[PDB]
A paper describes a structure:
The NSP15 endoribonuclease enzyme, known as NendoU, is highly conserved and plays a critical role in the ability of the virus to evade the immune system. NendoU is a three-domain 34 kDa protein that was demonstrated to form a barrel-shaped hexamer in solution by the assembly of two trimers. The oligomerization is mostly driven by the contacts of the N-terminal (ND) and the middle (MD) domains, while the C-terminal domain (CD) carries the canonical catalytic residues from the endonuclease family. In terms of substrate specificity, NendoU of the coronaviruses is described to cleave a great variety of single- and double-stranded RNAs in an Mn2+-dependent reaction, by hydrolyzing the 3′ end of pyrimidines, with a strong preference for uracil, and to release 2′,3′-cyclic phosphate and 5′-hydroxyl ends as products.
Residue numbers in the entry:
A (entry chain E), B (entry chain B), C (entry chain F), D (entry chain D), E (entry chain A): -1 to 345
Write the structure that this text describes.
Amino acid sequence: AMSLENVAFNVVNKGHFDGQQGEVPVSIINNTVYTKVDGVDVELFENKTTLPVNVAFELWAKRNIKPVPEVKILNNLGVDIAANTVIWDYKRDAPAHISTIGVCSMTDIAKKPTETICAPLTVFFDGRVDGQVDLFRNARNGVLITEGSVKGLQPSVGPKQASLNGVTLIGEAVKTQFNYYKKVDGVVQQLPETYFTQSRNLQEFKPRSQMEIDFLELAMDEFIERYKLEGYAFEHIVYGDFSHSQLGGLHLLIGLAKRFKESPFELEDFIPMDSTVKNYFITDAQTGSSKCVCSVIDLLLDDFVEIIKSQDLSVVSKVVKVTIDYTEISFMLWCKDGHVETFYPKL
Amino acid sequence: AMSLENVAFNVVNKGHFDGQQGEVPVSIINNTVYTKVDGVDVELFENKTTLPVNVAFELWAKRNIKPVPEVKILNNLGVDIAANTVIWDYKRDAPAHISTIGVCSMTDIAKKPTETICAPLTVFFDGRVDGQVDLFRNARNGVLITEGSVKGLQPSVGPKQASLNGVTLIGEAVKTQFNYYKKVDGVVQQLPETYFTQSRNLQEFKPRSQMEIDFLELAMDEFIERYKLEGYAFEHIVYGDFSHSQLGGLHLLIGLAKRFKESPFELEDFIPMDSTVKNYFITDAQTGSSKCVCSVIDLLLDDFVEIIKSQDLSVVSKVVKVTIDYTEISFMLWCKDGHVETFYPKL
Amino acid sequence: AMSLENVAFNVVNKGHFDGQQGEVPVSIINNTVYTKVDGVDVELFENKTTLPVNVAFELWAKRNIKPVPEVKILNNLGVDIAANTVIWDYKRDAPAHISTIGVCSMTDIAKKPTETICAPLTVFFDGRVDGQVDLFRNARNGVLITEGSVKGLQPSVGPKQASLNGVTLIGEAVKTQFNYYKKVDGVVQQLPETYFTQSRNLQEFKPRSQMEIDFLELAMDEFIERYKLEGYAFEHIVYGDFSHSQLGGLHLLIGLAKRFKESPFELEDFIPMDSTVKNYFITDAQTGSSKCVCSVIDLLLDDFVEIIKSQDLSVVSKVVKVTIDYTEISFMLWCKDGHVETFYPKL
Amino acid sequence: AMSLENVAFNVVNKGHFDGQQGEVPVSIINNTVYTKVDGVDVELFENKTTLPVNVAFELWAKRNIKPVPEVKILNNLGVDIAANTVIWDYKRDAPAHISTIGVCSMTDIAKKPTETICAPLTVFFDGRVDGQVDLFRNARNGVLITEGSVKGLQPSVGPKQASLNGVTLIGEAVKTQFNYYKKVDGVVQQLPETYFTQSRNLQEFKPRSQMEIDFLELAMDEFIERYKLEGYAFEHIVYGDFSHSQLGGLHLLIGLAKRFKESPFELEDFIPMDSTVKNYFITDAQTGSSKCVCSVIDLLLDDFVEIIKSQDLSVVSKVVKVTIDYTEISFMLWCKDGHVETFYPKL
Amino acid sequence: AMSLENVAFNVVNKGHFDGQQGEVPVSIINNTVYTKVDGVDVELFENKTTLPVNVAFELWAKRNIKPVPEVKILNNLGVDIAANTVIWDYKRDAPAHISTIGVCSMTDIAKKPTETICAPLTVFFDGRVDGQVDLFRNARNGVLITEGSVKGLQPSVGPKQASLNGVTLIGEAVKTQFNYYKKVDGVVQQLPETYFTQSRNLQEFKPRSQMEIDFLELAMDEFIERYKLEGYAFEHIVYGDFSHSQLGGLHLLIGLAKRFKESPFELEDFIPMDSTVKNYFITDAQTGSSKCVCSVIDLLLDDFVEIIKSQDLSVVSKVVKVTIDYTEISFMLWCKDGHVETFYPKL
């Protein structure tokens, strides 16, 4: 039987819900869950979601603590709901999906993914859990992830990294590379060929290729000449211009990291969530240059160089469609006199 | 096995906690408890107390639903806590006592009344529950109530009425008259002789003696002459004076009912709780006469007549101590030329 | 000197702030003020305003408890603020004015009415308080009320009733009729000749003239013939039409009381506030006839008859402006073939 | 056409209110504004102010995003309100002024600065906006800032730095130095000659002169001898004494940074707001030396040296008035035997 | 005398309550205390406790600002309440004890420690306050701390560090080493011989012995070969195993700091409170190794090697009881073939 006190007992004894028996005193005040330890109140959970505090507490205690795809990947694949698990969104401090299957009586729309209400929805299946591969095989719309290969389905190799308790990492002791499968209306889809965002963070940016190491260590002109990027506007697209009141270019995360190690500045993440492309209110503290909305994507610099070289520079103004993170991303390309003026992700 | 969902299931199915097994979905939002009935949220409880909402909900679901002494009686007896039950205060919309014994893990200071922490406290025992008379016999400080007589203890006959689910009544199908026993520091006390307030309500006042029937039906002068109350200031201290801006007298509830029948007015209960003496902000809508602090006691008119006749009229000013509801009530008496000027309960 | 605990002590001991010394323990949880009486929490005040809970509690404890003009009268006279007092609006359950003078440190814009910030504001002065008449004489914009006459100023006789602790009444033991004075930009104004709303309530409606007694007792036709109202659409304006799905007429409170005494119905006061003209969502429970916006004014039936008999009765459609409660009220008049079609207050 | 949904649309698409057309779904729960992005709720704004959540959200979305004077400068100049803009106070996380002009219908006291209610207030005008210089010329009380020079008024050169989106910076790509003008009762004032606070923070302290570089790098005695500050108590005033339980001196921010480089410590900003002089509860983690109220000012070390050399050493104890940030700052000076004992800003 | 406004005045002018006279305007909105400074609201306190906001604000303003034992020491010693002071728990952001003596009228159970209600409780006495040593001498259950020696009682030397305004430090300018005394039921106890935890922090870890310096600087194998720790499983117990999905060992804080220097990781403090043994949800960002519950204790490395060498290495499995911080800590010891398998604090 599911009880708030049992959930709190599991949290205080194991850090998350593990299906153990036991109760613990609980107080609920002002969107916060408290438990009494030695006659003194200790906070267990602060509700940051729009759900009721007890419902959110139960959903958070039942979050998946194995490595899972970043919620941006699930969004791009159209996942509506997860089967028998909770994907916690650590960017929003909330559950990734509004409804559940077989998790919480206050949010379940079904107990099993095989029920009728779930058929039109794209269900997330985890092949690491026994029986979920067969559930996906019988399901109408859904997305499957496995560590290895499943019989009779062609895998799509996903990102190297995954999310584990809200920290994104490429696994060494754990497998974070999954094979992705998708079915729409009963027919197994063939996922497109895509680039993947590196999901790196600005403050602890770490290079993942020799080219990124050079970009961080070298100066502008040396890097531009070493990789033959003379006609590709890297000094504006990637390095960023800080000479005018309006900030120029600066659409790759690695350029932001370069500037940050050079001189710190602050990003206003005015839509805090997980996306392939993020928009920031960027103020440069050294110069005062600023831009209200600056679209930033964190690609591997090698991949972005490949994309920028694979473009036709004869056009003046066009929209480039790049498949990144299993989704189509629109880039505006401006070329003049055989060289590009800007190349930024569209809004 | 104690759980919020189980408490809510008991409330939904039986109206109060009965110790049945089962669970229902619960939502807690803004000091309110909701449950899902056929996909929509139905409010079960609104926390009016200073306790956390879930704690207050559990305490309210476990209130005693048998006839119990009014909380004013328990207060006058010095009851600190009830043994293995919750006395709900329906005037404050809150539990009558701040701690419990063997009721709620968030508010219990002990599981049994025999614990050491309970020894200095005056515990309330209910002789209608098996084993409580022996618990009282072994207890150090406590108050016992029984339907009948217990061997070796002299009863104190209590009020005729009791409280049942928040409505005060003199029982016909149920017994509402109790025998009261009290122990202080291990020695059985002798409760004093007292009058009891009638706990009547202004809006639905009903007479309970022939004299009260006469008081309601007759006019002033004929009632005064029929009971020889000529020298006892009844026309001021009972009927009320409405000729000046400051309201005069009007200290008996029956006088309030008399005035209310002919002309309704406004009572502001600025300290809403249960007391032998109540203080009201009274404004008379017919005349505009008003008084900020009008102390009101609801005695049987016969008892008040007995009290007023048993007074010494030779004094000019003195404080009269009357035992009402097992407590000492101070009355201010003003006598002039051998007749009463005022007789009102002190503050 | 001013403290929340002292305010609570005054409320507990006197029902309102009286400037007595003493403190009492206070708790503030969820827009509610609690005090501890015998180890138990008793609610003193629930904040229904948009102010902070402690500020609202202090303002409510310092409300005027003498008879005062109704809030609608002060609004029509342009009163912005009261001098050294709080006018509590019992319709809104909030202070009538947003700033104070010499009342609350969290709300005062000045300590005295004579300061410069108060000069452009219309201040309310109470001649029953010593010195306020001279303050008004020196003030630039203000409104003065007195019981009697002041030297050198021509009174405007106000309504018969006033408000005392939130109950409207014509005073007998206390004087509720005031003389009104108004100064604009330093020059004493001449208040217009006006009608006054009776401020009566629907459920407990009392006639104030023989004509209203006849209206309540007689049937329609006898009343119409007795007062020669044959060409004045009293069938529609006053009595109300309940034959169509859309409710007809019914713009006088006495008509609503007439309908209510025989068949109760539902009023939705969707703008709960004090005004000369009230708008209600009327649903007639007997017939189902309903109207979303039904403007209602509570005039004395004699005065409304006088108004309706002073109309031209020849033009087809016009707006007639009547001075009621010191303000101009627009009525739409429809006349056809020399008789009134409808006559309702404009929105 | 002002609307909460339109404000949220502007925030979602541009990070601030820009006047674009569009709507997004909005939820308001518990002083937080949420919008729905792809079926999940994303928090846009958390209300930290005393205003209603929607009002605060609208005011925050309409904050000035160009460089503006720091809030303390405006406070020292007596600015009551800004004309047609919102100055956001990022220290308090709230609007800098309580009323607006032509910004929000819930907080506006006027639509244009030329209205009568604004005349007694000191309005803030921004010369970078067309028409505001003329508005200031016509205004009775106001403060004007311009990038350049206005015809017929003598500028007062302001601080080098300004605030831009809540980060203080000396602008390179944008101009952050303003000319200040002030009118009182219609007459153009002559602003005093003042020092300016450097508005630096502890963690990222940077020198702004060769003397500060020496102070950060040199040892105590080396610096004292190099700049001949032998009789000026720098070892107590600036460096700070950490030998007793009560912390000694340490009234300049550069000294705090000097100590912080060696051993970090705790600053408790118990009045979090912007002011020329800040009071901190300082506990030194290395030694345990602490002081409850440590007044700190961030002057350029050169300017403070000039101030302390400009003093008269013969007096024993006097109050020194220094004009800093357009306001008078009282310093307490103690001298003994012709040398300074202590020199701290008064409380 | 005790007022919320006076408490706020003391906080504004002194940073804490000092018993100065004065009042300041206060607003209370949503568990936050605001004061008005120059017409704008500045937040003074945000309530993080389960108490009412004003009660918590008063308790926080009256916290002890002198060095005090860490609340874990008081908990292990059984302290129920402090005498005439408030111990603030900065881990919980709440008062360390639920009741007070002579502090706050809303939370006091007595005014003096000598009253009867306090007799069965273990009261905390501070010998640095005059009269408290005598109060402890007369008390029945209590704990005493003094800087020096008291006549006729054998001291127990406490930890080197204490807490000062929420920061733990070994005092140089102030004494943080206390002598501890304890009485149970009137008889002076003899405290056991104990180890003490170092209370150090992960991110700013500092070695406090030559052995810890070597542990931080050396490599694993070099350190093990020194100090002769070959048969004591330090590789697992102290350094931590990061090769499997489940994190191995890592039960000493110094090992956490060692790993953190080379590669930062995530600690989830799911029970945030002060304790001798802490449980963390640790996920290693470099490898992905993680463990839901990691018992961590911050002992001096010398003390820990002494404990582990003091063990009987012939048993296969047993529970070792170590007295740390005046409490018994159970360690599970696993040994095979005469060498340790693992040695972790029991959970």
